[PDB]
Amino acid sequence: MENFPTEYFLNTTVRLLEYIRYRDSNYTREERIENLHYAYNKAAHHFAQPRQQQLLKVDPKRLQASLQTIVGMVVYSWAKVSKECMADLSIHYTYTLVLEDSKDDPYPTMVNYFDDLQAGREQAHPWWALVNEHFPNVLRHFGPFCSLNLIRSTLDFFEGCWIEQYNFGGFPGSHDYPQFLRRMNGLGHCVGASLWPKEQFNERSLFLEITSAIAQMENWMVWVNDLMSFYKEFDDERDQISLVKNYVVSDEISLHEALEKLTQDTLHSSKQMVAVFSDKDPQVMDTIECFMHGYVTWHLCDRRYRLSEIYEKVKEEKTEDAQKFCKFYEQAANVGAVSPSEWAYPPVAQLANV
Amino acid sequence: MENFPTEYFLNTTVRLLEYIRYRDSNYTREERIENLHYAYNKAAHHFAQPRQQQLLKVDPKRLQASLQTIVGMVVYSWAKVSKECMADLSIHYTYTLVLEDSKDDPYPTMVNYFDDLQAGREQAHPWWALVNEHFPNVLRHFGPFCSLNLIRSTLDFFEGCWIEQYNFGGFPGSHDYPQFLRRMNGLGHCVGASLWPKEQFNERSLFLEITSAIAQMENWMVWVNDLMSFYKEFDDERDQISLVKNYVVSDEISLHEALEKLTQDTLHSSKQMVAVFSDKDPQVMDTIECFMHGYVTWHLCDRRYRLSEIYEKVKEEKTEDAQKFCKFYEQAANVGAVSPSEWAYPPVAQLANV
């Protein structure tokens, strides 16, 4: 298909928000600004240090833009955790996002990975050097079990980027490949487990709840991100591999059938999220619910996804979906539309030179 | 579900072996005995050392039986790798199997996992202490990429056993839980990656086929093991959680529907295995095929799965399936039925006292 499935897309999005019970919360705009700036400020100072500036090969502007998108994602989705926790997670998820910019073959730097790890010697790959050095600031917020999940998921992600460098959508007929890759780079267990700071939750008392949340949130989070991203990726001849495009190549089905598959998985996952946790520990359901809502709000407000375009184009249609959509959208903007000048300053590069 | 779906099990099993093209190979009985003894001898001496005897808390008889099952699994499935590789892998997979015996909460021994890892200090949990100390003997056989996969999968497996201690089949309605747990403790990427020793394969030249093999083989081997195991588990109130039983609890379907799901996944996986690799690099297809056949042969011959029982009971039925089954079975026994006295000696405990 060449024309974007605007109608089909709107319907799915509306069903999605309704399933997760998208609705206003007590998390105010002023509170978001307060959190956005705190998280951004600590992270910016971190990436501005000489060592970080040295080992992390990234274009300054790309770094600035990456840091800002991640800070917004964390502050909006991990609504219930402390300012420090939001800050430390912002730094970690900015490291992960930035690794996708590397085109350098990991092979030479991974030949002695285990031996250096076991012996406690700094890793040859600079990214690992920075990420493992900083990890304790993230792990200090969690119990041993959740920490193990963050560590595994980040290791998986590193392998994920390695594979991504081959721009391989899978062999025709390799049905297990698409999701195999999406899980590898989705950071599902990192996200799912970072929602439970030991300061607010008891890892041993809620072990079953948490484990279940990690398992379910893993797929909800990656599928929602894929769906919300479908619009910006539609015309991007630069983005050649994605869950949807890989479904097409590996399963040998049409882009529309691929999008349908994603839609069914996303809705089903949303439905089961609510069915399973609504009657469980209220604190757990709150974190889960606020994450889903924040995650959606972030996608709707961040320019990167350009959903503002879908809005503009259908804010005058009397369709049922088009209207339900614009309402949800306006709701997001209301609390999420914030000018970067209100929190993202000064730029990282500025702090770096000083 | 009070009676074994024997007829269904026979049909599925036959279809399984036909799909993967089960047939005789040049791997002779005498060659297996030669490999069985070599692998067992090196591993037995390893586990008999004082340090290993000390930190590894396992009942001697259980250790002996676990070592013998694993050596068989490796020698029969990793048919194309060297004797040393078979031995070192037998040691590693015996460590993983034995971890399932632990009833000790991992929590206290994982509180400082990352900091000790980062600093190069011996891990507090004795299993990690032994496994990481021994790991290089396994990793030396592979390139950096495959090594990364073995490391991740083993780390996942450790989390898997942690979760297994709660004997939790998942919340009703938690559809993503069953497979989440099966992947966690399936060692899928460990198995899939350990099929490519750098001595026989070039990790960079075959990156795509290996990555694809890891992705597809992960599900094939866990599902086949579950199916092959359905028998010995059909009436074991001890093995309360399993992929099938978790499908029942989490998806709220009948045991028969669960078993059907597993059957469809197993056959479809087998079908896609052959379709994707048959026309690829012949050495790659050979390793994959021999692994599938060896893995099946091992399940058919190892007493643990008691498939010999299914045999006796239907070797005189003139059903099409029952006959195709007994033929395949006899084929396995022909080259796989080997008395332990021919290779598994002396017992680990004997070597430990000396």
From Swiss-Prot, chains A, B:
Some of the cofactor binding sites show unusual localization within the protein. The keyword Nucleotidyltransferase does not apply. Its cofactor is Mg(2+); Mn(2+). One of its GO terms (molecular function) is trichodiene synthase activity. Benzyl triethylammonium cation (BTAC) acts as a competitive inhibitor of trichodiene synthase reaction in the presence of pyrophosphate (PPi). Trichodiene synthase; part of the core gene cluster that mediates the biosynthesis of trichothecenes, a very large family of chemically related bicyclic sesquiterpene compounds acting as mycotoxins, including T2-toxin. The biosynthesis of trichothecenes begins with the cyclization of farnesyl diphosphate to trichodiene and is catalyzed by the trichodiene synthase TRI5. Trichodiene undergoes a series of oxygenations catalyzed by the cytochrome P450 monooxygenase TRI4. Trichothecenes are sesquiterpenoid toxins that act by inhibiting protein biosynthesis. This is Trichodiene synthase.
